[PDB]
Amino acid sequence: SAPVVGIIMGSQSDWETMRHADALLTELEIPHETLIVSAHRTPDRLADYARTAAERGLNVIIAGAGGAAHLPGMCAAWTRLPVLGVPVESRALKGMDSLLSIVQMPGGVPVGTLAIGASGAKNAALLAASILALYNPALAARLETWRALQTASVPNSPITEDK
Amino acid sequence: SAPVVGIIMGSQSDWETMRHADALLTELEIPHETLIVSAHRTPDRLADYARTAAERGLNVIIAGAGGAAHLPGMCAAWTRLPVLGVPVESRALKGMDSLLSIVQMPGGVPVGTLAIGASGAKNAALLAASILALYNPALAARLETWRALQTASVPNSPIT
Amino acid sequence: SAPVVGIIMGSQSDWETMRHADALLTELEIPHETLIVSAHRTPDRLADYARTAAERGLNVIIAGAGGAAHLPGMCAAWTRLPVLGVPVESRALKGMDSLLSIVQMPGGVPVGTLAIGASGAKNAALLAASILALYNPALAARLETWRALQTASVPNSPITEDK
Amino acid sequence: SAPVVGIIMGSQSDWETMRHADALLTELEIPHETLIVSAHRTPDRLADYARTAAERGLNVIIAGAGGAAHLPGMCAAWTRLPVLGVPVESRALKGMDSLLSIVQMPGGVPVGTLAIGASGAKNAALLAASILALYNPALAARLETWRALQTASVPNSPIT
Amino acid sequence: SAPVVGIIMGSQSDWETMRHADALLTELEIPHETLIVSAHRTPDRLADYARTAAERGLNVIIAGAGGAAHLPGMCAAWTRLPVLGVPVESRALKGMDSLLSIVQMPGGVPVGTLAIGASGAKNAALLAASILALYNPALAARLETWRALQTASVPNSPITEDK
Amino acid sequence: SAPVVGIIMGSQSDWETMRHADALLTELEIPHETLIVSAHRTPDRLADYARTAAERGLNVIIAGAGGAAHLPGMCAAWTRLPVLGVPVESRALKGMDSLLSIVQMPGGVPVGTLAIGASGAKNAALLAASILALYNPALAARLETWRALQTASVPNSPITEDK
Amino acid sequence: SAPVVGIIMGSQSDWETMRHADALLTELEIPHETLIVSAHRTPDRLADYARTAAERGLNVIIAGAGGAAHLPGMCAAWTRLPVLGVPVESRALKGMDSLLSIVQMPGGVPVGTLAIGASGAKNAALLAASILALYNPALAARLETWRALQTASVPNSPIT
Amino acid sequence: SAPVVGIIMGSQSDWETMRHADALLTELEIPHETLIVSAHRTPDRLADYARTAAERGLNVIIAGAGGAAHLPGMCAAWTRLPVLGVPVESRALKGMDSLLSIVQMPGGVPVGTLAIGASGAKNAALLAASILALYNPALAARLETWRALQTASVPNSPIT
């Protein structure tokens, strides 16, 4: 029942993207919490959240941010837990600023970075699931079933119908 | 002790980068295997490697490649294990090709992507350590020590 | 009657782009097949499709994908046939991720890469036609006529009409 | 034996790159010609070369250029033959200029584009080989051997 | 009366951009011609147009194209006249492909390149005007008046009105 | 009452962006002036504005421009005052041209550059405020209150409501 | 004299760049402190440093970092002081990563960003000087002299 | 003979690039002047230079600069003469900054922009020559000869 994944994001405007991570964890029956933590507007909130995450029982953090996207990296600075980063698509630079400011962590403090946007959010949840599945055989079986269904559900040919 | 992390790379030319991952895992006493597996030149080797990884006892795969870098993605396609991707710096485009071809995975098949180059290789090994630490207390304590020493070791001022 | 070109793509969403390759092969009376093969969701389907392509009588493969676009390159890993790659335009990065993940093949495994989007799909079909035309004189004549008409159909001046 | 592939490049400075195409064709015993043809400095040479390519017995043209790289595109404009384009690495922009000015052909006139640099030059020759192999069984068997040896030759682990 | 500037473009779709060059030459009373010449679909048309441009009395060529934009550069290969290049904005890459394929001419064959899009087209006409003005004092006076008016017409402050 | 910050921009079309700087200075009760100065169309206006800014009592200049964005840099060439640059988002290149042409000043003439677009304009005003606050204790207290409110106003969790 | 500018950088490897800021402040006789403070490796050091900067008498902070460069932004998050950011040139991406991760601050927390590299480090110190000059007449006169000498010193023609 | 082309550059560091423009004008016997004029460090020098260019008899200005490259644009702001812009290759961003800050002029004030680097400097001088040739028959014949020799001199095949 207690959360084992934390999904955090800098603002409400990130929710349109991060909701995909939430939905997938729920689908796979992974208890989690979903919070707003602003690296720039609530830096002490971030420090406290990241430094206590492990003792609160969290195993993985999924962090989403856009633009000068510092939330994943700074979270990783304060926790020993694996931190997964979702670059939120930005208006001008289409998430390239988000992507580079998350993935280009210097050696010593990792953030496992996923694709720009909704795909990245979904995949952050799947990656979290695959981490948790290493020690949780029921979840491993649910993930196997999920991946197997994804594969079996791919059609053989396109619907080539003109309109 | 049987390996719990697999480090794979497309070619010898990737080793200058991926050796940083190997060194870090060794420093933390994480049993691992370090292999060349080419998505493009040995696709069946890759398929076999990835599909049997879990049953062989691997927990995490770290995959490095450059250019049109397909090794991490395709590895992830064949395993349920977490796959971590290291973009190797390419000659012309400085690993931007490597980066985009690894990180931009469509929803459904993740690769946790690290920085271009040596930093990414080191961090993939650290990220793998932090994953393993979740269910290995002795390793968790060694990782805590590693992180603590990294933090404590930063000087207060630059030298000239 | 049996197909001599295979058009493959990762998903239905690629069809909006890849249909242009289909239309042009049909226009030039080139028998072909059109399939969905996902590099990431159906990797064994891909392996089987590519490794058997030659014995099934295929001469050219046209492969389209977007984002982390691995389908053309992995197809080329398993076939000795020429593989032509169409970068499908992606939402955030406008097909630059598609383009780099297709064209930047290391030495040893080629993918002949065309333009991002519909233009690339049309041109993949024309390039395939020009390959096939080398051994097929009827098709060579149809291609010559096609290219000649394209040239003769270019207007001499723009319609400069204000609106 | 009359050439069936033409390798053309805009200048001597492209040769460091395009020599990889020449070497590969020679390795596979594909008769070819290797020439300098500048889209910008010898545009009439280019026109003549491209328009007569087919009647001279050429089957594939491999064209290399850098910067505002127009040689492959314009070659394709004048021939019905398949034209393969090699972006040469440029000094400032590392072949991104070369790449975009070759690959982004409008619909109607294709250029099959390979990677920036030596890799692209090698792969253009391989792609040309795979085209020719469709109607030359002996060459198809040599290409099969080449691909098989590439695959079998990849080591299983890196050397230090 | 006879044209002294040639405006050329690859297709009708370029006219939305190149019309700005046409309008400005007309405004400055510069006789010119406006044509479609496709580098890729009518390469012999291009060769003939560029090689005869000087003897036909043209002094400047303004050439517009998008994507793999070869029309300005190839025009310059065949004429000794100054050639001005307008990168037409492309769909996927926003004219960056247009820009690089026009401006990055190797040493020996220049194209004077202007901004991506309508601004570039307007400025190609102004640059042409400034070239012609060197030998044409009536035009020099019209250009001076034009530039002077542009400067005098800039407002001192923005209209800060809320809506 | 007399202005201590100058907000300048190249054209009316920049106002949609620069208005955010104006609004924030007003919010913080910072007297300022807001003007159009075109680097390219009114270069002498710019020279006069920048060279007299200090003697007129200005302490900070906020300059906004897009495309080949020279207004901030040239302002800084003629004043000893701190100049803050706002890259206005451009149509084709999304403000990347704006950004590089403002931030990449060679050593010797600084422009403190903020984010592309509205965010940058808001932050140029906040940065100006933080500069002025160093010598103005009433303003320092208003800025502290503002920053404190920003921090306290961040919600703890997203509104996760489906629609 | 107590420092009124703080120069901070993530690591020794940044010093080759940030030394230009230090030299300029020294040239203008601006008391300052020059420190290593890592956003990623010493986040609590950063928090303390930034939150106490004002009460320690600092007026401006100049922060340099490369790659995923978070030091300036996070410094600004904890201080009301003006923070100036120097993108350090990174190996692979030449400071484009550094630049975007520093300049693209969301509204509410500014960082005044300078050019990638040594130029940016020098200009951050000049920009800090121009800020301090607003309420220090002696410094304003020294900055006027510095700017005047820069202008007067430019040669009229190049040397060969 | 009074100069009819002005070559200007922001600093000595631009000379390695702009010397190619100077050499070409000399080769074609085009009287010119070659000067350092900094948009940022000598803005009044620039204003004077550009505003008096025409009355001094200049016909074309070639302006080179790097980074946030404002010299060509601002020159064009003050003269009715055609201004040609040479993006100097910058250290970090390889002249992409230079290129965008020169070519992306808003409508109303043109700069005819050439390639990044030495090529652009050479081509700015050629473009200036082609402008002058319109009303100088002797020069037009020399330019014809130059272009003809360039074309005729291209080899037919590469050397090894």
Side-chain angles (χ1 to χ4, degrees):
Chain A
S1 179
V4 295
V5 179
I7 303 174
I8 66 175
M9 67 208 79
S11 72
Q12 176 63 27
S13 61
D14 298 326
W15 175 245
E16 171 59 28
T17 301
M18 299 311 289
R19 69 190 173 85
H20 299 283
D22 169 78
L24 197 33
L25 296 184
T26 295
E27 184 176 352
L28 291 172
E29 303 178 10
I30 297 166
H32 61 284
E33 62 183 14
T34 303
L35 306 164
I36 287 167
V37 179
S38 176
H40 298 144
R41 298 175 171 203
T42 63
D44 290 320
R45 187 189 297 181
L46 175 50
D48 177 72
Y49 180 88
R51 101 181 323 122
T52 63
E55 72 200 56
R56 288 183 285 114
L58 297 181
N59 287 203
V60 184
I61 300 177
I62 296 169
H70 302 174
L71 176 63
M74 290 308 303
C75 188
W78 272 298
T79 189
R80 277 61 161 134
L81 298 177
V83 177
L84 307 183
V86 177
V88 178
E89 194 182 333
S90 55
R91 178 199 78 250
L93 299 188
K94 307 303 299 299
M96 181 55 74
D97 44 4
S98 311
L99 172 57
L100 294 182
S101 58
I102 298 171
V103 75
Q104 289 294 91
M105 291 294 283
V109 180
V111 171
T113 309
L114 292 309
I116 294 158
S119 285
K122 178 165 161 183
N123 277 344
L126 282 164
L127 184 48
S130 71
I131 289 171
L132 292 168
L134 297 174
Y135 185 84
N136 181 334
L139 171 58
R142 294 197 295 278
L143 182 59
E144 171 68 34
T145 294
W146 193 96
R147 289 290 300 270
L149 188 57
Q150 172 171 255
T151 289
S153 292
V154 180
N156 282 309
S157 65
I159 290 167
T160 56
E161 263 211 289
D162 312 323
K163 249 112 233 34
Chain B
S1 213
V4 296
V5 180
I7 301 170
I8 66 178
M9 70 206 74
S11 73
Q12 178 66 40
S13 66
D14 301 323
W15 174 238
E16 173 58 20
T17 304
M18 303 304 294
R19 68 191 176 85
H20 298 282
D22 172 81
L24 190 289
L25 292 187
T26 291
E27 186 183 5
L28 287 176
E29 302 181 35
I30 299 168
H32 63 284
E33 63 187 9
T34 300
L35 304 166
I36 293 169
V37 179
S38 172
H40 296 148
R41 297 178 177 205
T42 66
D44 290 320
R45 190 193 293 181
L46 177 50
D48 287 344
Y49 183 85
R51 79 174 349 107
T52 64
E55 66 191 79
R56 287 184 280 120
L58 292 187
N59 284 214
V60 181
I61 298 172
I62 297 170
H70 300 172
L71 179 55
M74 292 308 298
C75 187
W78 272 300
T79 187
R80 285 60 169 130
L81 298 173
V83 178
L84 311 180
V86 178
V88 178
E89 192 181 330
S90 52
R91 180 189 150 69
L93 300 189
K94 308 301 296 295
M96 179 60 72
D97 50 4
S98 316
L99 173 59
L100 292 185
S101 59
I102 293 165
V103 74
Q104 288 294 86
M105 288 297 283
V109 181
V111 171
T113 310
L114 291 305
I116 297 158
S119 282
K122 182 171 169 183
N123 281 345
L126 282 163
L127 182 52
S130 76
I131 286 161
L132 295 169
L134 298 176
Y135 47 108
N136 182 339
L139 176 57
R142 297 200 301 280
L143 177 58
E144 170 60 34
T145 293
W146 195 97
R147 290 296 298 273
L149 176 61
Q150 173 171 256
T151 289
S153 294
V154 176
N156 295 112
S157 52
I159 294 171
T160 317
Chain C
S1 179
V4 295
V5 179
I7 303 174
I8 66 175
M9 67 208 79
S11 72
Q12 176 63 27
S13 61
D14 298 326
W15 175 245
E16 171 59 28
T17 301
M18 299 311 289
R19 69 190 173 85
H20 299 283
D22 169 78
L24 197 33
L25 296 184
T26 295
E27 184 176 352
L28 291 172
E29 303 178 10
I30 297 166
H32 61 284
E33 62 183 14
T34 303
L35 306 164
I36 287 167
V37 179
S38 176
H40 298 144
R41 298 175 171 203
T42 63
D44 290 320
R45 187 189 297 181
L46 175 50
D48 177 72
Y49 180 88
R51 101 181 323 122
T52 63
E55 72 200 56
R56 288 183 285 114
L58 297 181
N59 287 203
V60 184
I61 300 177
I62 296 169
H70 302 174
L71 176 63
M74 290 308 303
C75 188
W78 272 298
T79 189
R80 277 61 161 134
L81 298 177
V83 177
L84 307 183
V86 177
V88 178
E89 194 182 333
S90 55
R91 178 199 78 250
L93 299 188
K94 307 303 299 299
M96 181 55 74
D97 44 4
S98 311
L99 172 57
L100 294 182
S101 58
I102 298 171
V103 75
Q104 289 294 91
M105 291 294 283
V109 180
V111 171
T113 309
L114 292 309
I116 294 158
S119 285
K122 178 165 161 183
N123 277 344
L126 282 164
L127 184 48
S130 71
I131 289 171
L132 292 168
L134 297 174
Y135 185 84
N136 181 334
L139 171 58
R142 294 197 295 278
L143 182 59
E144 171 68 34
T145 294
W146 193 96
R147 289 290 300 270
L149 188 57
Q150 172 171 255
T151 289
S153 292
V154 180
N156 282 309
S157 65
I159 290 167
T160 56
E161 263 211 289
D162 312 323
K163 249 112 233 34
Chain D
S1 213
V4 296
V5 180
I7 301 170
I8 66 178
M9 70 206 74
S11 73
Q12 178 66 40
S13 66
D14 301 323
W15 174 238
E16 173 58 20
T17 304
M18 303 304 294
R19 68 191 176 85
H20 298 282
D22 172 81
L24 190 289
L25 292 187
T26 291
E27 186 183 5
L28 287 176
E29 302 181 35
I30 299 168
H32 63 284
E33 63 187 9
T34 300
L35 304 166
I36 293 169
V37 179
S38 172
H40 296 148
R41 297 178 177 205
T42 66
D44 290 320
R45 190 193 293 181
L46 177 50
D48 287 344
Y49 183 85
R51 79 174 349 107
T52 64
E55 66 191 79
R56 287 184 280 120
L58 292 187
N59 284 214
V60 181
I61 298 172
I62 297 170
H70 300 172
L71 179 55
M74 292 308 298
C75 187
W78 272 300
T79 187
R80 285 60 169 130
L81 298 173
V83 178
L84 311 180
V86 178
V88 178
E89 192 181 330
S90 52
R91 180 189 150 69
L93 300 189
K94 308 301 296 295
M96 179 60 72
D97 50 4
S98 316
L99 173 59
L100 292 185
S101 59
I102 293 165
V103 74
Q104 288 294 86
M105 288 297 283
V109 181
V111 171
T113 310
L114 291 305
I116 297 158
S119 282
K122 182 171 169 183
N123 281 345
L126 282 163
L127 182 52
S130 76
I131 286 161
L132 295 169
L134 298 176
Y135 47 108
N136 182 339
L139 176 57
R142 297 200 301 280
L143 177 58
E144 170 60 34
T145 293
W146 195 97
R147 290 296 298 273
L149 176 61
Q150 173 171 256
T151 289
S153 294
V154 176
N156 295 112
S157 52
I159 294 171
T160 317
Chain E
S1 179
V4 295
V5 179
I7 303 174
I8 66 175
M9 67 208 79
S11 72
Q12 176 63 27
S13 61
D14 298 326
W15 175 245
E16 171 59 28
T17 301
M18 299 311 289
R19 69 190 173 85
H20 299 283
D22 169 78
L24 197 33
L25 296 184
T26 295
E27 184 176 352
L28 291 172
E29 303 178 10
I30 297 166
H32 61 284
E33 62 183 14
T34 303
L35 306 164
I36 287 167
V37 179
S38 176
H40 298 144
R41 298 175 171 203
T42 63
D44 290 320
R45 187 189 297 181
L46 175 50
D48 177 72
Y49 180 88
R51 101 181 323 122
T52 63
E55 72 200 56
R56 288 183 285 114
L58 297 181
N59 287 203
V60 184
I61 300 177
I62 296 169
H70 302 174
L71 176 63
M74 290 308 303
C75 188
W78 272 298
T79 189
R80 277 61 161 134
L81 298 177
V83 177
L84 307 183
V86 177
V88 178
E89 194 182 333
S90 55
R91 178 199 78 250
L93 299 188
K94 307 303 299 299
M96 181 55 74
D97 44 4
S98 311
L99 172 57
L100 294 182
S101 58
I102 298 171
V103 75
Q104 289 294 91
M105 291 294 283
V109 180
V111 171
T113 309
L114 292 309
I116 294 158
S119 285
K122 178 165 161 183
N123 277 344
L126 282 164
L127 184 48
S130 71
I131 289 171
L132 292 168
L134 297 174
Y135 185 84
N136 181 334
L139 171 58
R142 294 197 295 278
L143 182 59
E144 171 68 34
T145 294
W146 193 96
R147 289 290 300 270
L149 188 57
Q150 172 171 255
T151 289
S153 292
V154 180
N156 282 309
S157 65
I159 290 167
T160 56
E161 263 211 289
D162 312 323
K163 249 112 233 34
Chain F
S1 179
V4 295
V5 179
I7 303 174
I8 66 175
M9 67 208 79
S11 72
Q12 176 63 27
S13 61
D14 298 326
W15 175 245
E16 171 59 28
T17 301
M18 299 311 289
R19 69 190 173 85
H20 299 283
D22 169 78
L24 197 33
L25 296 184
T26 295
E27 184 176 352
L28 291 172
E29 303 178 10
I30 297 166
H32 61 284
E33 62 183 14
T34 303
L35 306 164
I36 287 167
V37 179
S38 176
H40 298 144
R41 298 175 171 203
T42 63
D44 290 320
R45 187 189 297 181
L46 175 50
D48 177 72
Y49 180 88
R51 101 181 323 122
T52 63
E55 72 200 56
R56 288 183 285 114
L58 297 181
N59 287 203
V60 184
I61 300 177
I62 296 169
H70 302 174
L71 176 63
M74 290 308 303
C75 188
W78 272 298
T79 189
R80 277 61 161 134
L81 298 177
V83 177
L84 307 183
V86 177
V88 178
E89 194 182 333
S90 55
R91 178 199 78 250
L93 299 188
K94 307 303 299 299
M96 181 55 74
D97 44 4
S98 311
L99 172 57
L100 294 182
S101 58
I102 298 171
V103 75
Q104 289 294 91
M105 291 294 283
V109 180
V111 171
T113 309
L114 292 309
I116 294 158
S119 285
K122 178 165 161 183
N123 277 344
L126 282 164
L127 184 48
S130 71
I131 289 171
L132 292 168
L134 297 174
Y135 185 84
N136 181 334
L139 171 58
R142 294 197 295 278
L143 182 59
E144 171 68 34
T145 294
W146 193 96
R147 289 290 300 270
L149 188 57
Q150 172 171 255
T151 289
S153 292
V154 180
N156 282 309
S157 65
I159 290 167
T160 56
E161 263 211 289
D162 312 323
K163 249 112 233 34
Chain G
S1 213
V4 296
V5 180
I7 301 170
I8 66 178
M9 70 206 74
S11 73
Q12 178 66 40
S13 66
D14 301 323
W15 174 238
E16 173 58 20
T17 304
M18 303 304 294
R19 68 191 176 85
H20 298 282
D22 172 81
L24 190 289
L25 292 187
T26 291
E27 186 183 5
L28 287 176
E29 302 181 35
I30 299 168
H32 63 284
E33 63 187 9
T34 300
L35 304 166
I36 293 169
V37 179
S38 172
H40 296 148
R41 297 178 177 205
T42 66
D44 290 320
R45 190 193 293 181
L46 177 50
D48 287 344
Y49 183 85
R51 79 174 349 107
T52 64
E55 66 191 79
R56 287 184 280 120
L58 292 187
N59 284 214
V60 181
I61 298 172
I62 297 170
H70 300 172
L71 179 55
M74 292 308 298
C75 187
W78 272 300
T79 187
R80 285 60 169 130
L81 298 173
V83 178
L84 311 180
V86 178
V88 178
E89 192 181 330
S90 52
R91 180 189 150 69
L93 300 189
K94 308 301 296 295
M96 179 60 72
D97 50 4
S98 316
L99 173 59
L100 292 185
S101 59
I102 293 165
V103 74
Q104 288 294 86
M105 288 297 283
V109 181
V111 171
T113 310
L114 291 305
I116 297 158
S119 282
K122 182 171 169 183
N123 281 345
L126 282 163
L127 182 52
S130 76
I131 286 161
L132 295 169
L134 298 176
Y135 47 108
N136 182 339
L139 176 57
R142 297 200 301 280
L143 177 58
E144 170 60 34
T145 293
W146 195 97
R147 290 296 298 273
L149 176 61
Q150 173 171 256
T151 289
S153 294
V154 176
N156 295 112
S157 52
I159 294 171
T160 317
Chain H
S1 213
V4 296
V5 180
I7 301 170
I8 66 178
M9 70 206 74
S11 73
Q12 178 66 40
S13 66
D14 301 323
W15 174 238
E16 173 58 20
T17 304
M18 303 304 294
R19 68 191 176 85
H20 298 282
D22 172 81
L24 190 289
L25 292 187
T26 291
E27 186 183 5
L28 287 176
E29 302 181 35
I30 299 168
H32 63 284
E33 63 187 9
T34 300
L35 304 166
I36 293 169
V37 179
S38 172
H40 296 148
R41 297 178 177 205
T42 66
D44 290 320
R45 190 193 293 181
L46 177 50
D48 287 344
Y49 183 85
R51 79 174 349 107
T52 64
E55 66 191 79
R56 287 184 280 120
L58 292 187
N59 284 214
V60 181
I61 298 172
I62 297 170
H70 300 172
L71 179 55
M74 292 308 298
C75 187
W78 272 300
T79 187
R80 285 60 169 130
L81 298 173
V83 178
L84 311 180
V86 178
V88 178
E89 192 181 330
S90 52
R91 180 189 150 69
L93 300 189
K94 308 301 296 295
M96 179 60 72
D97 50 4
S98 316
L99 173 59
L100 292 185
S101 59
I102 293 165
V103 74
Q104 288 294 86
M105 288 297 283
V109 181
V111 171
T113 310
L114 291 305
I116 297 158
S119 282
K122 182 171 169 183
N123 281 345
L126 282 163
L127 182 52
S130 76
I131 286 161
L132 295 169
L134 298 176
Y135 47 108
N136 182 339
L139 176 57
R142 297 200 301 280
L143 177 58
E144 170 60 34
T145 293
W146 195 97
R147 290 296 298 273
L149 176 61
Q150 173 171 256
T151 289
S153 294
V154 176
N156 295 112
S157 52
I159 294 171
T160 317

